[PDB]
Design an enzyme around this catalytic site. Structure first.
Site, PDB file in Angstrom:
ATOM      1  N   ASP D  57      47.449  39.519  68.648  1.00 20.89           N
ATOM      2  CA  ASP D  57      47.560  40.132  67.332  1.00 20.89           C
ATOM      3  C   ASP D  57      47.322  39.094  66.244  1.00 20.89           C
ATOM      4  O   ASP D  57      47.918  38.012  66.264  1.00 20.89           O
ATOM      5  CB  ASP D  57      48.937  40.772  67.158  1.00 20.89           C
ATOM      6  N   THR D  91      43.861  42.041  62.731  1.00 16.76           N
ATOM      7  CA  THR D  91      42.826  41.028  62.907  1.00 16.76           C
ATOM      8  C   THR D  91      41.575  41.382  62.112  1.00 16.76           C
ATOM      9  O   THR D  91      40.953  40.505  61.500  1.00 16.76           O
ATOM     10  CB  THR D  91      42.495  40.869  64.392  1.00 16.76           C
TER      11      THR D  91
HETATM   12  N1  LIG Z   1      35.877  49.683  74.263  1.00  7.12           N
HETATM   13  C1  LIG Z   1      35.325  49.262  73.099  1.00  7.12           C
HETATM   14  N2  LIG Z   1      33.985  49.267  72.918  1.00  7.12           N
HETATM   15  C2  LIG Z   1      33.424  48.852  71.768  1.00  7.12           C
HETATM   16  N3  LIG Z   1      34.128  48.402  70.714  1.00  7.12           N
HETATM   17  C3  LIG Z   1      35.482  48.344  70.756  1.00  7.12           C
HETATM   18  C4  LIG Z   1      36.169  48.779  71.981  1.00  7.12           C
HETATM   19  N4  LIG Z   1      37.486  48.620  71.759  1.00  7.12           N
HETATM   20  C5  LIG Z   1      37.631  48.124  70.504  1.00  7.12           C
HETATM   21  N5  LIG Z   1      36.437  47.958  69.907  1.00  7.12           N
HETATM   22  C6  LIG Z   1      36.219  47.438  68.534  1.00  7.12           C
HETATM   23  O1  LIG Z   1      37.047  46.298  68.298  1.00  7.12           O
HETATM   24  C7  LIG Z   1      37.553  46.331  66.962  1.00  7.12           C
HETATM   25  C8  LIG Z   1      38.976  45.792  66.914  1.00  7.12           C
HETATM   26  O2  LIG Z   1      39.865  46.706  67.551  1.00  7.12           O
HETATM   27  P1  LIG Z   1      41.456  46.449  67.566  1.00  7.12           P
HETATM   28  O3  LIG Z   1      41.786  45.400  68.601  1.00  7.12           O
HETATM   29  O4  LIG Z   1      42.137  47.795  67.639  1.00  7.12           O
HETATM   30  O5  LIG Z   1      41.747  45.832  66.106  1.00  7.12           O
HETATM   31  P2  LIG Z   1      42.107  44.276  65.885  1.00  7.12           P
HETATM   32  O6  LIG Z   1      41.091  43.507  66.695  1.00  7.12           O
HETATM   33  O7  LIG Z   1      41.966  44.089  64.394  1.00  7.12           O
HETATM   34  O8  LIG Z   1      43.524  44.159  66.394  1.00  7.12           O
HETATM   35  C9  LIG Z   1      37.477  47.774  66.493  1.00  7.12           C
HETATM   36  O9  LIG Z   1      36.882  47.840  65.195  1.00  7.12           O
HETATM   37  C10 LIG Z   1      36.603  48.489  67.504  1.00  7.12           C
HETATM   38  O10 LIG Z   1      35.432  48.998  66.859  1.00  7.12           O
END
Ligand SMILES: Nc1ncnc2c1ncn2[C@@H]1O[C@H](COP(=O)(O)OP(=O)(O)O)[C@@H](O)[C@H]1O
Ligand SMILES: Nc1ncnc2c1ncn2[C@@H]1O[C@H](COP(=O)(O)OP(=O)(O)O)[C@@H](O)[C@H]1O
Ligand SMILES: Nc1ncnc2c1ncn2[C@@H]1O[C@H](COP(=O)(O)OP(=O)(O)O)[C@@H](O)[C@H]1O
Ligand SMILES: [Mg+2]
Ligand SMILES: [Mg+2]
Ligand SMILES: [Mg+2]
Lengths: 536, 518, 44, 518, 43
Positions: D57, D91
């Site tokens: 995170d 993030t």
């Molecule tokens: N299975 C996947 N395939 C393609 N893109 C993904 C997938 N899972 C997450 N993402 C992309 O990764 C980004 C970050 O997701 P998330 O981890 O929920 O937020 P953060 O990285 O800010 O904690 C999102 O914008 C999403 O578009």
């Protein structure tokens, strides 16, 4: 302890002792730290590194011998790898970055065998037997190029030149550097194509201009200018001539004086007046001996007094002052002259002959430098390098110096191989095949030596952004299907993994030393048990 | 396991590539505001003696300011070479080489381009940039009138970036005539620069002759007409002969007085041979004592002492004479001729002025300034202008300045970027955008727009007009042929070659190793 | 084949993973001597 | 004149700014490698107590790392606000807010744009980006079948970046059923997470009923069939008499013996009122003394003591009953029923398990891992997944993820940028390129070329197809409807709004005054 | 307005302000020494 201080050796608490598995782990990791530094600079896709000296001077090079030389270390195992690349640069002068990667690859495969309970001597005994099997295998695959004439022999020199010029800064001009490096050996060499003298080729760097101004000049390049610069800068020969009749003198122009400390006592005015005439008679006699011999430019080691500035100006005789003793040897070789110790021994047969003597303006101010050219093939070839940076003019010296080390090794008869990782792959499968026949306790020793040879081709794929697994699997499958050993890694990506079409050529004497220096050094490292290091 | 000793700083990772690029940013940003005629001078604070130095040249600024970053030392060395080779353009090389790293930083970070790929991209990009300047070079050396006029326009461009941009119109002829006096000589040590404090800055003049700071010894008149000047390098003061093993063995002091008197007879006999030339003036680079100086009084010959050897070569070229020693033979020896010799005074120190000299191969420049900082700047401003004009006599090719030469090279770079394809297209086009920064900074120092004004110059060249350029006075696009903005072709190639080679240095460094200081 | 695709950046994590494995295997070497009936006790 | 004082660090103008830009770059690069399902986890080692934490995170990384840069705390606070209001995307907010400054850094430098003018560019760009993102949303909850399926796709996207990404296929049902059992009430106090050492990550199972770790009384049996559950706010303890504020006045010890016996009969009469309910199980908030515990054995009543404040509401909602205080009126506070009260054991700590209750309004999640570093992340992995799924109940608007949402919003920015005259149009186009940096990093962390994937995705959406997206498994362009990548509209709206406002703050800082630390 | 050049550097104008203050402070010291009513300065 029983209550009394127990000290066997002076500086007890200062010195430390290492033993057991912890002593072996510290030696392997010390080589891995040096390897990962050298592995990044290995191959034409490698990168240079900045070397900061304690005095403030900086050095940028990828050469494993130069990087480790100025590198300040602590552990003695990493200091042994310093002289490893130094051993490669002093004799052969090529492959200094390959001996460090290959030696650490032998130590990485040996650490896995030590953890299995193998005695270190049994590991060293397996590498010595596997080293001779790899050299004898590659020696049978190579062919002799000495059957070709002098026209084709120049082509093989251009092939190995362009390979050594890569991986280093200012690699865009390698096309012209390869041509100039071969022509130096074409001019200076024995008629039998053997045992060429390298000391006849001098490396003189110059800071300024651009790299495109680098050209070959046969002659002597001095940092001293013409004394009393009222004379023309460019000296031209007489209409008809045998030559310029260059004169070389190690004796300054002075009235004769004893080497021992002397006392000249003048007891009367008549004895003092005779010294006045005796003074001017010698300066008039010394300038006449040069004119009667037909000489033009006079070279003096210790210089001369201002009296002879106008004297040599009347007779139109160029002169230089404060020439070093080492440069005087360089002058007599180019012009094929003889150093004249004194005017009484001065003759026309001892005078040198060169095409033209002139000086260049170079930059705005800088300094005045003298340049000598030859009218035919001679025994002196001086390298002329220019650059827009002090670091470029420096590295380009050793860049062409290592290029000349590859050509002089090709002068040795009947040793040639093709580079690009094709040599290590060919010798790797030959060792792994013997491991199945021998078996026994040494079966794992040939496996560690075979996996270490494959590290060099896999390192080439790392700097080129390739897959070391897919590249090594293609090379091994090609040698099993066909007997052609010319397939290797391509870091330039022009296609045609065959080295024959890519012209890449390396000296066999250079690749043979890489295995010998790596195997014999690991044999000493694996024998180290107690490590006693005193405090600084 | 740490193989390195104590207090050894090394960066094997991103911190190294970040410190190498950012280290050149602070160097480029320091000399950025000094580019162009609207640029501002920089101040240097000395760590000792409290000696302030104000110079617009980037070579002195980088060498005076201590820099411990190896990435900075690369840009300092290329500035010292640019000063020692061509003599001008030290700031342009530092700025252009820094912008090449700016465009290369975004390709490795954002575009994920291989470092050698960026290096190999500049190789094919610099080949088109150097070939673009060859077709745009014009050789006017076929006419002496057009060649002399071009020497004036080149001096106006170099003097514009310095403090002389206001009076450069009056100083363009002084620097042009000084090079014509050399008659193709590229040596700048033959021209003397005498800095005088006080007066108007526009009062700087160039006399025909040799202005010597030294004065006649005692009784020699200040002004004399039709005087033959003679130069002697050696001795002629309390002659020691040669060997040091000579001594006087004296039985009684009656004979000792005759031995010392014989030393004066040697001095009288040598001066008597000088009078055989029929010269009204004699000059010795070695200082002259009182006894030999009095011998010139009855002969009516002038005497000058304590002349520096670098001024002797300057003096010999003004009088057209020959340095003469061993006076026994008058025939093989040559003397200089001068119409009139007068001792003048500029400021508190009187000077020796020459006029009506036969040879013009050397001269002396006199400068006037309000402060010594302006004097040190006026000498360095002319040193950069006289160096380009000296190399112009050798290589007579010229290229228009004022942002034109930088944009013409970028026209050929964008053409070669299409045929290469690959990932090098981003590296080749990065070299073209790096050439945009040089005319862009010219508008930034003048308070102009860095986008629309640059776009007007870029769109005018692609329409078939190669003579378009940037005008900083009116803030618009003007013709460079009419304004008279032109620079030497050797300066154009030197900036492109030095910056392209310097950019290939730091891009090859993955690891920076710092040994313990000593 | 070269100069194309992508180039790896920030290679420190490659060294961080190596520093974590080497440090973890060094701890596993001291406990390795205690494995099996021939193992020895560790006094702390 | 120094008015501020000694040891006061202050930066002005170009020194004040570029301190905020480097701060955002240093903060943005830390969470840059954590973006995407292929991102790498970061280990945080404390300077004291030798405590290490593995977390993916971006909010928890910035809170632990000490930062003295005033602009760094700007990106730390927005990561907390994004974590407070949503809990996911912290993030992406730190990266997107940093990319706005990286693009604006070249706007003031290359294009020479006033910082306030750039602010006006983001105001018009963010207004068009939110309108395009709102129209791309799809209504949900109109069908109970599609509402449950959309929650499964959200859990797979959030857990893709977490270490749970391998087992997230089985965990999509784990996090989904916990939200449906909440019956519309959004709280995470009703969801319990228990850490267990041993096994593998996929061994985590969903709890039917409510499981809370407790212990039965000494004489009380473990398994009771059809037990009645009651929770009491009041604690069984020595109460003094009633009002406190008193002490007994004893004239003779004859009445003192019956005095202590009277206190024993007070708690005995209180249990008699509790026994009127006919309960087989009793739960208290605080420790129960041994004296009232023996009264539960003869009446066949289970006892649970030392209940946490959160455990009181979690247990009361699952059983359906309410907390009883006075016990006076039996008719009020009707009590639920539990089928199986038998206790189980997971690991070395036995856990009390319930089954077959009336309401599922509270939940419990059992997690198993090899080390506490995984268990610490396993709790925070579901905490971010359950937070979005809980906010999806109240907010039904959802959009397509996988780098598609950032590209669709950038399409409307470039459309309105052509109709905006002036220098502020360059700041509008900079906001569109900043939205493309998020899908660019997704390809960099996956080991695929970003220039090829972004270019194919950018040109595909302009053709009219808005369903295209990035597929990191095959390294090509794939449909987001087929892959099942769905994110809530509240998630993407909070990222664009927080990042655009955070970048506006740092562009408004022309001076930084640092007071002397205490 | 918004189309004006920010120039990114307010330092050049602030450096000149610090140079004028220190320069006028030196000229104001000898101000009392000007004219027949001037005062001598002992160093
Ligand atoms: N299975 C996947 N395939 C393609 N893109 C993904 C997938 N899972 C997450 N993402 C992309 O990764 C980004 C970050 O997701 P998330 O981890 O929920 O937020 P953060 O990285 O800010 O904690 C999102 O914008 C999403 O578009
Ligand atoms: N242009 C090239 N094509 C193929 N292989 C090359 C090329 N240049 C160098 N190599 C290979 O890289 C290895 C290292 O070469 P280099 O680093 O240039 O000098 P050194 O051999 O001293 O390390 C050599 O063994 C050679 O086979
Ligand atoms: N009147 C003018 N109009 C437009 N451009 C000019 C004018 N005068 C000078 N320039 C440009 O300004 C530049 C000054 O560069 P300069 O600061 O001398 O670089 P360096 O210090 O490296 O020599 C020149 O390249 C020239 O083209
Ligand atoms: Mg080599
Ligand atoms: Mg200039
Ligand atoms: Mg997330």
């Amino acid at each position: 302890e029983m209550g009394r201080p127990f000290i066997i050796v002076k500086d007890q608490g200062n010195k430390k002792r290492q033993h057991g598995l912890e002593a072996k782990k510290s030696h392997i990791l010390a080589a891995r730290s040096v390897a990962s530094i050298i592995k990044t600079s290995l191959g034409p896709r490698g990168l240079d590194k900045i070397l900061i000296s304690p005095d403030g001077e900086i050095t940028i090079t990828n050469d494993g011998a130069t990087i480790l030389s100025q590198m300040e270390l602590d552990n003695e195992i990493a200091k042994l790898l310093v002289q490893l690349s130094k051993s490669q640069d002093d004799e052969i002068g090529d492959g200094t970055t390959g001996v460090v990667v290959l030696a650490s690859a032998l130590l990485d495969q040996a650490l896995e065998l030590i953890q299995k309970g193998i005695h270190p001597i049994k590991i060293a005994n397996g590498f010595d037997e596997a080293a001779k099997l790899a050299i004898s295998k590659l020696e049978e695959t190579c062919d002799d190029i000495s059957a070709s004439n002098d026209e084709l022999f120049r082509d093989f020199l251009l092939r190995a030149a362009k390979t050594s010029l890569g991986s280093k800064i200012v690699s865009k001009d390698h096309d012209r550097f390869a041509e100039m490096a071969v022509e130096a050996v074409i001019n200076v060499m024995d008629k039998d194509r053997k045992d060429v003298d390298f000391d006849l080729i001098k490396m003189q760097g110059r800071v300024g201009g651009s790299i495109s101004d680098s050209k070959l000049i046969n002659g002597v390049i001095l940092d001293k200018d013409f004394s009393h610069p009222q004379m023309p800068k460019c000296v031209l020969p007489k209409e008809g001539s045998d030559g310029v009749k260059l004169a070389i003198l190690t004796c300054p122009f002075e009235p004769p004086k004893p080497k021992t400390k002397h006392k000249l006592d003048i007891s009367s005015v008549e004895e003092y007046q005779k010294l006045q005439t005796y003074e001017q008679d010698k300066f008039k006699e010394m300038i006449d001996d040069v004119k009667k011999a037909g000489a033009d430019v006079v070279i003096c080691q210790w210089g001369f007094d201002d009296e002879a500035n106008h004297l040599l100006l009347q007779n139109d005789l160029p002169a230089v002052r404060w020439v070093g003793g080492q440069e005087l040897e360089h002058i007599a070789i180019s012009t094929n002259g003889r150093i004249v110790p004194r005017f009484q021994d001065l003759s026309k047969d001892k005078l040198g002959t060169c095409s033209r003597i002139y000086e260049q303006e170079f930059g705005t101010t800088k300094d005045r430098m003298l340049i000598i050219e030859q009218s035919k093939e001679t025994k002196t070839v001086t390298c002329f390098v220019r650059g827009s940076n002090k670091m470029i003019v420096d590295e380009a010296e050793r860049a062409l110096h290592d290029s000349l080390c590859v050509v002089r090794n090709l002068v040795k008869d009947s040793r040639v191989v093709y580079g690009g990782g094709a040599a290590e792959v060919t010798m790797s499968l030959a060792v792994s095949e013997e491991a199945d026949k021998q078996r026994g306790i040494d079966q794992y020793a040939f496996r560690g030596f075979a996996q270490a040879l494959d590290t060099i081709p896999m390192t080439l794929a790392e700097n080129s952004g390739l897959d070391p697994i897919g590249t090594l699997s293609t090379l091994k499958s090609k040698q099993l299907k066909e007997k052609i050993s010319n397939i290797g890694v391509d870091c330039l990506g022009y296609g045609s993994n065959d080295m024959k079409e890519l012209f890449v050529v390396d000296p066999f004497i250079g690749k043979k030393q890489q295995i010998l220096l790596a195997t014999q050094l690991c044999r000493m490292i694996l024998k180290i048990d107690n490590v006693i290091i005193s405090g600084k | 396991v740490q193989i390195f000793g104590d207090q050894v700083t090394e960066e094997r990772a991103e911190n190294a590539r970040l410190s190498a690029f950012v280290g050149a940013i602070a160097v480029g940003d320091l000399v950025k505001s000094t580019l162009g005629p609207k640029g501002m001078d920089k101040l240097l604070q000395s760590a000792s003696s409290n000696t302030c130095m104000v110079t617009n040249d980037g070579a002195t600024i980088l060498k005076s300011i201590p820099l411990d970053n190896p990435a900075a030392k690369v840009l300092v060395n290329i500035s010292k070479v640019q000063d020692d080779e061509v003599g001008d353009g030290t700031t342009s090389v530092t700025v252009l080489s820094a912008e090449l790293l700016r465009e290369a930083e975004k390709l490795i970070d954002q575009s994920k381009i291989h470092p050698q790929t960026i290096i190999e991209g500049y190789r094919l990009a610099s080949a088109a940039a150097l070939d673009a300047l060859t077709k745009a070079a014009v050789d006017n050396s076929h006419d002496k009138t057009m060649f002399r006029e071009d020497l004036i326009h080149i001096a106006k461009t170099t003097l514009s970036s310095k403090i002389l941009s206001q009076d450069k119109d009056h100083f363009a002829e002084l620097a042009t005539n000084a090079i014509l006096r050399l008659k193709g000589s590229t040596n700048l040590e033959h021209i003397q620069i005498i800095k005088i404090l006080g007066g108007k800055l526009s009062d700087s003049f160039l006399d025909e002759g040799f202005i010597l700071a030294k004065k006649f010894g005692n009784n020699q008149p200040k002004r004399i007409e039709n005087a033959k000047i003679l130069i002697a390098n050696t001795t002629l003061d309390t002659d020691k002969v040669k060997i040091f093993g000579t001594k006087f063995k004296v039985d009684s002091t009656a004979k000792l007085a005759q031995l010392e008197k014989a030393e004066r007879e040697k001095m009288k006999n040598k001066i008597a041979k000088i009078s055989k030339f029929g010269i009204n003036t004699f000059i010795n680079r070695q200082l002259i004592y009182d006894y030999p100086e009095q011998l010139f009084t009855d002969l009516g010959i002038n005497s000058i002492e304590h002349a520096d050897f670098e001024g002797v070569e300057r003096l010999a070229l003004v009088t057209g004479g020959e340095v003469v020693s061993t006076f026994d033979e008058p025939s093989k020896c040559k003397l200089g001729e001068c119409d009139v010799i007068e001792e003048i005074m500029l400021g508190e120190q009187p000077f020796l002025k020459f006029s009506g000299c036969k040879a013009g191969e050397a001269c002396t420049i006199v400068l006037r300034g309000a402060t010594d900082q302006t004097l040190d700047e006026a000498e360095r401003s002319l040193h950069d202008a006289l160096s380009v004009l000296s190399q112009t006599t050798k290589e007579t090719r010229t290229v228009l300045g004022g942002g034109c030469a930088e944009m013409v090279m970028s026209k050929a770079v964008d053409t070669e970027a299409q045929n290469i394809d690959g990932k090098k297209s981003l590296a080749v086009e990065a070299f073209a955008r790096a050439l945009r920064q040089l005319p862009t900074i010219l508008a930034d120092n003048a308070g102009f727009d860095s986008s629309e004004l640059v776009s007007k110059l870029r769109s005018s060249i692609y329409n078939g007009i190669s003579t378009s350029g940037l005008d900083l006075n009116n803030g618009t696009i003007a013709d460079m042929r009419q304004l008279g903005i032109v620079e030497s072709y050797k300066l154009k190639r030197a900036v492109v070659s030095s910056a392209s080679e310097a950019a290939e240095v730091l891009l090859r460094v993955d690891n920076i190793i710092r040994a313990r200081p000593r | 084949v070269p100069s194309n695709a992508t180039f790896k950046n920030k290679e420190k994590p490659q060294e961080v993973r190596k520093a974590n494995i080497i440090a973890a295997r060094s701890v596993a070497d001291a406990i390795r001597t205690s494995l099996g009936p021939k193992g020895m006790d560790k006094m702390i």
